[PDB]
RNA sequence: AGGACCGAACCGACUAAUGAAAAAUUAGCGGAUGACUUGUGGCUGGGGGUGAAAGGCCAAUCAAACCGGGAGAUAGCU
RNA sequence: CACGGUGGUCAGGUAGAGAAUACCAAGGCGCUUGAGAGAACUCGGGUGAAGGAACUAGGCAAAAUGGUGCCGUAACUUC
RNA sequence: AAUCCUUGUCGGGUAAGUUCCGACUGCACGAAUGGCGUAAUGAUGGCCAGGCUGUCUCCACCCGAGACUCAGUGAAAUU
RNA sequence: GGUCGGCUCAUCACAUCCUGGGGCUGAAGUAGGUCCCAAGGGUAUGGCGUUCGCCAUUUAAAGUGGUACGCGAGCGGGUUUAGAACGUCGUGAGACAGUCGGUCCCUAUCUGCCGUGGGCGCUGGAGAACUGAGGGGGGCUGCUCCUAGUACGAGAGGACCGGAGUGGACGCAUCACUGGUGUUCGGGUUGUCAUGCCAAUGGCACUGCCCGGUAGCUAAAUGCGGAAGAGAUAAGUGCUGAAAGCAUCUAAGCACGAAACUUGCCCCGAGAUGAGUUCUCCCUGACCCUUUAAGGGUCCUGAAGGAACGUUGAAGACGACGACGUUGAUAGGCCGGGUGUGUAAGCGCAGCGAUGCGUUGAGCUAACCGGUACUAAUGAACCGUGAGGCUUAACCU
């Protein structure tokens, strides 16, 4: 099943009347609209393109545009491509609403999380601090040996190092979807989802599910 | 710490590939005073965008 | 990381670079146009024009505020009796930075920060 | 954002009593036991409050049983079915954290007339 | 947020004023035990004439914590002291007649009723 | 009264982390009216001095100083 | 080396037992590269939920204690 | 014991003590190269407790100096 | 001409400790024994220079080895300098794998590894979205309940198979909550100096010492994950079935069969030079010249787009990536709100005064929220061109 890209707005709380308060991530999901329809045929492989938002007629280039048009379609912010499962049939122009996702139970959310930037290991990967005293010489938080003396001779591929950490593309899975409102243009989902405030994220039915 | 080999002046080179510097693209004209200056800079004689911001 | 933070610390302690601010502010409001590194005439904004928001509403109380931001009379007066009654109706932007080049002795690039009703 | 505010501002009660730090409260919270709900008060001084719309707490402390005890209740959780002003509080700070160090004679705070 | 040398004060009568912790039970590597997590305690401070005497390696169950529980509606609860209930090794109901100080509704359950049921007050 | 006590100067150098420094730094540390400390000048000379003794110290040199000489010592070794 | 050592004399104010310490006077200086940025890591500091030596060869280091007056003060003792 | 066998054996202390304290076959104590005691003293060795704590569970954030970028100056070991 | 142990980081083997699959059992059940397959993941904290070991208490389990007994250009208790002493040996200097003190340097050239850019390429150029060759991550497991006190058993005890919940450890994300931090916010307060003085303020004393605390970042906080399924198998089980009238799991054929393998989940990924696809956009001019060919040159021309500059960012070492540049909310300011602090100053009253009360939940309030062109984001200029080779085929006419 065909996903949306929706906007992360922020974190809020529903609180049931039983008593429990749900921790819930608004997904501000307006209407995703197709541009380009992929099938086995021509591009080799069945799948829509969409698009949402707006955009600045002036800031959006010319192939981009060319591209909207012949779709017959406003220009959005981005363009983002959903795979069809088999019985899945979509027009050039249509609209897709988070109406859709009023049936489903979970969903898989997937978006770029935050960038921490350069990480060493501590905080990349969890490597535990070497003592903070005891004589301990300028060796607090560096991360100890990376290899073993001449035979291999050599750092290991995918050796755990400092580097760029977040701002990257993750997809948290099975979140339970709390509350479609197609009023607002909203989606509620337990549980916080990649990325900061105002990020766009993707929010599909859950693979696994 | 410290090389075994004396690097090659060919490395060097490459080394120093990127150490180039790059020439203001274009310098731009004050359209009241005529004179050259960087973009969004006041100009030496001290006009901006036209208007004389500073007194010499 | 620094996600949504303010301020720009300037290779300065906190206290000295507060003091700076205390005298830089105080030199524009004297001079009204003074040449100092970008970076810097920006952080001003964030002092000079909050004390001529202040010294628009004339009173003691006010007056007391300005004082112990800048601790100069003389400029208080200024701000007061001067400016305040010249940025009246204006609502924010009361300051000017213009970029000028670049300083001789280290690089650094300069700019005149200046009241905008000044000529 | 706007949109999150319109969702938790149709979620907030709108009878919640005006209280301060320093005053003697009483929180009555629901309690499931088996297949009965019923109404545990839990009498105190209100240490701290959190004001954030939705998100608003409000901590008070107690001594049970001899034992002090803090409860950080959520002012808009339909856990907490009534609070109720008994006593109210001249103290001179934002929260009353010194409290936890202190006891019976020492740990009094006078009372706020007019 | 109980761990090992973490020294709880009794809630029972059963002797004990003050035991240490020495192990928290239910898994490998477990860091922690709250409240109704079942540890192992040695004695370290117990009346001159109780049911229990200094050095009884035993278990226990903790009731109150000064970190505290935290209930479903976001709400928390916190204690003054870290407070337990001590146990027989085998049978794991406690050995005390009588519960001083409050407790949770976190304890109530088969294992622990007796405890909820002697508490003066439940929270 | 005191090779008495606490403690700045002054004299030292137990722990610590860290070239400006061919032994220092900062934070603490010991003594601080004495077998104390310090200025100026004097005397003791190399198998000699001096040594509350560690082979310590004797001009950044010590199980025998430095300088010059025997001297191009000798080197079955590199 | 425009880099630690170096004997004597002078000794203001407020607080203080004080030539300690803090803030000042007289007087003298800002230490001859600056400007930005606000990653990892290093140095020197600050604070830290719950636990409180579980750290470690070792409580190393930190934390803590810290003043004047008054009450009070054990074993042992060469008194 | 400033004793190989040896973590001797028994007792104390600890949930657990190759260390510590008290006792009982001196590999190889012993009486001025002094024996055995000993109040006081010790930047002395060992062990235990109270307090205290980022020592640690398990790291988090913050403030400064470097690190990074720009301009000026401009080394070194090694080869 | 760097030798133990500890820490930090590991990685491989399988002679497997746990988990998984099976045969035999002196396997009734439960729990065991033993052998076979299996290396996906997992595989303890403490007490007493050690490794080890003993002991305490856990655990599904606390595997055995290799890696210069892995790891000191990553971080000194032990042995192994100089001081001193005991026992012992020696006439003695001294000595003893017999028994308090005692400097662990190195700015990284190359390989390697973790990140991140610049160039050129991919055959006209440009902007996007993809496919996915290949590569990497992930793969742990307890307890409880039901099935069922059923099967089994003389009883005691007590299941397989299959399902449901809730934990531990590990990982990913996140800041709504609970909290930490919060020298950029508010307040208390000691000493002192200043603003002529009072009052009120500011400086300095670790942010002077404290108490609170916004945004961010964050864990102890709270969401999610490990799978199911499929394919081909391992040991093993078989079905039909001769060679060998029988028998035989096999030689022909057919079937089942495990955390291993290939997929399925997540991430990177066309420099995948084998350089892929799809969509869209842009350029449709002159003449010289000759060593006549994918040649060189001069006028005009300059697109799509790009870069640069500026305002900048929950992006960031720098590059990069994103947003915006007046047809504008990109930043600062301003307005309103919120949050925090906790009733400012001034004035009045009460008090001999310290102080209290009123005005007053006041004043002030960072990084937040919603608005607002007041200040700054300039008209340009610069790079990028002018229809894109040859040979075959098929098509169109």
Redesign the pocket.
């Given at each position: 099943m065909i996903g949306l890209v929706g906007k992360?707005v922020?974190?809020?709380?529903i609180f049931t009347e039983d008593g429990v308060?749900?921790?819930?991530?608004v997904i501000e999901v307006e209407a995703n609209r197709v541009?380009?329809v992929?099938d086995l045929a021509?591009?080799?492989?069945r799948?829509i393109?969409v698009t949402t938002g707006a955009?600045?007629?002036?800031?959006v280039?010319?192939?981009?545009?060319?591209?909207f048009?012949?779709?017959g379609v406003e220009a959005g912010?981005?363009?983002?491509?959903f795979?069809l499962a088999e019985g899945e049939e979509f027009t050039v122009g249509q609209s897709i609403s988070v109406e859709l996702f009023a049936d489903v139970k979970?969903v898989?959310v997937?978006?770029?999380?935050?960038?921490?930037?350069?990480?060493?290991?501590?905080?990349?990967?969890?490597?535990?601090?070497?003592?903070?005293?005891?004589?301990?010489?300028?060796?607090?938080?560096?991360?100890?040996?990376?290899?073993?003396?001449?035979?291999?001779?050599?750092?290991?591929?995918?050796?755990?190092?400092?580097?760029?950490?977040?701002?990257?593309?993750?997809?948290?899975?099975?979140?339970?979807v709390v509350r479609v409102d197609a009023e607002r243009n909203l989606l509620l989902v337990?549980?916080?989802?990649?990325?900061?405030?105002?990020?766009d994220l993707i929010v599909?039915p859950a693979?696994?599910? | 710490?410290?090389?075994?080999?004396?690097?090659t002046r060919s490395?060097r080179g490459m080394?120093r590939?990127?150490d180039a510097?790059?020439a203001?693209?274009?310098?731009?004209?004050?359209?009241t005073s005529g004179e050259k200056?960087?973009?969004?800079?006041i100009t030496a004689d001290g006009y901006?965008?036209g208007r004389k911001v500073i007194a010499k | 990381?620094?996600?949504?933070?303010?301020?720009?610390?300037?290779?300065?302690?906190?206290?000295?670079?507060?003091?700076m601010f205390?005298n830089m502010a105080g030199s524009l409001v004297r001079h009204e146009i003074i040449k100092?590194?970008?970076?810097?005439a920006?952080e001003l904004?964030?002092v000079v024009?909050?004390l001529?928001?202040?010294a628009?509403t004339d009173?003691?109380?006010?007056r007391?505020?300005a004082?112990?931001?800048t601790?100069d009379?003389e400029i208080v007066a200024k701000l007061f009796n001067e400016l305040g009654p010249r940025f009246a109706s204006?609502?924010?932007?009361?300051?000017?930075?213009?970029?000028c080049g670049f300083?001789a002795?280290?690089?650094?690039?300069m700019?005149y920060i200046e009241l905008?009703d000044r000529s | 954002?706007?949109i999150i505010?319109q969702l938790e501002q149709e979620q907030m009660k709108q009878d919640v009593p005006s209280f301060?730090?320093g005053d003697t409260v009483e929180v009555k919270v629901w309690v499931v036991e088996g297949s009965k709900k019923r109404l545990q008060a839990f009498e105190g001084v209100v240490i701290?409050?959190?004001?954030?719309?939705?998100?608003?707490?409000f901590?008070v402390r107690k001594i049970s049983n001899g034992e002090g005890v803090?409860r950080?209740f959520?002012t808009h959780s339909p856990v907490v079915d009534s609070i109720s002003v008994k006593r109210r509080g001249?103290?001179?700070?934002?929260?009353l954290?010194?409290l936890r160090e202190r006891t019976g004679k020492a740990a009094r705070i006078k009372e706020?007339l007019? | 947020?109980?761990?090992?040398?973490?020294?709880l004060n009794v809630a029972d009568n059963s002797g004990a004023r003050r035991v240490?912790?020495?192990?928290?039970?239910?898994?490998?590597?477990?860091?922690?035990a709250?409240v109704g997590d079942i540890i192992?305690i040695?004695?370290?401070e117990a009346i001159p004439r109780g049911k229990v005497k200094?050095?009884?390696?035993l278990?226990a169950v903790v009731v109150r914590?000064?970190?505290?529980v935290?209930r479903?509606d976001?709400?928390?609860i916190?204690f003054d002291?870290?407070a337990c209930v001590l146990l027989n090794?085998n049978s794991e109901q406690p050995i005390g007649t009588r519960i001083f100080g409050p407790v949770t509704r976190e304890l109530r359950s088969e294992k622990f009723m007796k405890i909820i049921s002697l508490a003066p007050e439940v929270l």
């Amino acid at each position: 099943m065909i996903g949306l890209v929706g906007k992360k707005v922020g974190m809020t709380r529903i609180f049931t009347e039983d008593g429990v308060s749900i921790p819930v991530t608004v997904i501000e999901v307006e209407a995703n609209r197709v541009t380009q329809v992929k099938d086995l045929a021509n591009d080799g492989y069945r799948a829509i393109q969409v698009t949402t938002g707006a955009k600045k007629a002036n800031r959006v280039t010319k192939p981009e545009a060319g591209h909207f048009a012949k779709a017959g379609v406003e220009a959005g912010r981005g363009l983002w491509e959903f795979r069809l499962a088999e019985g899945e049939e979509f027009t050039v122009g249509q609209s897709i609403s988070v109406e859709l996702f009023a049936d489903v139970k979970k969903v898989d959310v997937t978006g770029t999380s935050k960038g921490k930037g350069f990480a060493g290991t501590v905080k990349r990967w969890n490597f535990r601090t070497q003592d903070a005293t005891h004589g301990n010489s300028l060796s607090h938080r560096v991360p100890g040996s990376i290899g073993q003396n001449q035979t291999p001779g050599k750092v290991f591929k995918g050796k755990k190092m400092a580097g760029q950490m977040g701002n990257e593309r993750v997809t948290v899975q099975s979140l339970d979807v709390v509350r479609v409102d197609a009023e607002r243009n909203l989606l509620l989902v337990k549980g916080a989802v990649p990325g900061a405030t105002g990020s766009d994220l993707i929010v599909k039915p859950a693979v696994k599910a | 710490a410290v090389q075994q080999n004396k690097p090659t002046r060919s490395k060097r080179g490459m080394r120093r590939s990127h150490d180039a510097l790059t020439a203001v693209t274009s310098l731009s004209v004050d359209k009241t005073s005529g004179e050259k200056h960087l973009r969004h800079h006041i100009t030496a004689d001290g006009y901006y965008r036209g208007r004389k911001v500073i007194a010499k | 990381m620094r996600h949504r933070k303010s301020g720009r610390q300037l290779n300065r302690n906190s206290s000295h670079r507060q003091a700076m601010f205390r005298n830089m502010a105080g030199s524009l409001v004297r001079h009204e146009i003074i040449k100092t590194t970008l970076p810097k005439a920006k952080e001003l904004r964030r002092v000079v024009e909050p004390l001529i928001t202040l010294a628009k509403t004339d009173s003691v109380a006010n007056r007391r505020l300005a004082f112990a931001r800048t601790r100069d009379n003389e400029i208080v007066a200024k701000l007061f009796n001067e400016l305040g009654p010249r940025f009246a109706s204006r609502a924010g932007g009361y300051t000017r930075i213009l970029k000028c080049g670049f300083r001789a002795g280290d690089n650094a690039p300069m700019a005149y920060i200046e009241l905008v009703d000044r000529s | 954002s706007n949109i999150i505010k319109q969702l938790e501002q149709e979620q907030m009660k709108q009878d919640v009593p005006s209280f301060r730090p320093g005053d003697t409260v009483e929180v009555k919270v629901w309690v499931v036991e088996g297949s009965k709900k019923r109404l545990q008060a839990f009498e105190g001084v209100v240490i701290a409050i959190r004001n954030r719309g939705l998100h608003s707490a409000f901590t008070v402390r107690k001594i049970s049983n001899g034992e002090g005890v803090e409860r950080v209740f959520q002012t808009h959780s339909p856990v907490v079915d009534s609070i109720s002003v008994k006593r109210r509080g001249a103290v001179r700070k934002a929260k009353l954290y010194y409290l936890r160090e202190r006891t019976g004679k020492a740990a009094r705070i006078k009372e706020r007339l007019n | 947020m109980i761990q090992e040398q973490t020294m709880l004060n009794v809630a029972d009568n059963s002797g004990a004023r003050r035991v240490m912790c020495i192990k928290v039970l239910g898994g490998s590597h477990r860091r922690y035990a709250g409240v109704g997590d079942i540890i192992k305690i040695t004695i370290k401070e117990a009346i001159p004439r109780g049911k229990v005497k200094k050095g009884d390696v035993l278990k226990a169950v903790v009731v109150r914590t000064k970190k505290g529980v935290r209930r479903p509606d976001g709400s928390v609860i916190r204690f003054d002291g870290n407070a337990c209930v001590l146990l027989n090794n085998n049978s794991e109901q406690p050995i005390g007649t009588r519960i001083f100080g409050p407790v949770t509704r976190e304890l109530r359950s088969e294992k622990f009723m007796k405890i909820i049921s002697l508490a003066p007050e439940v929270l």
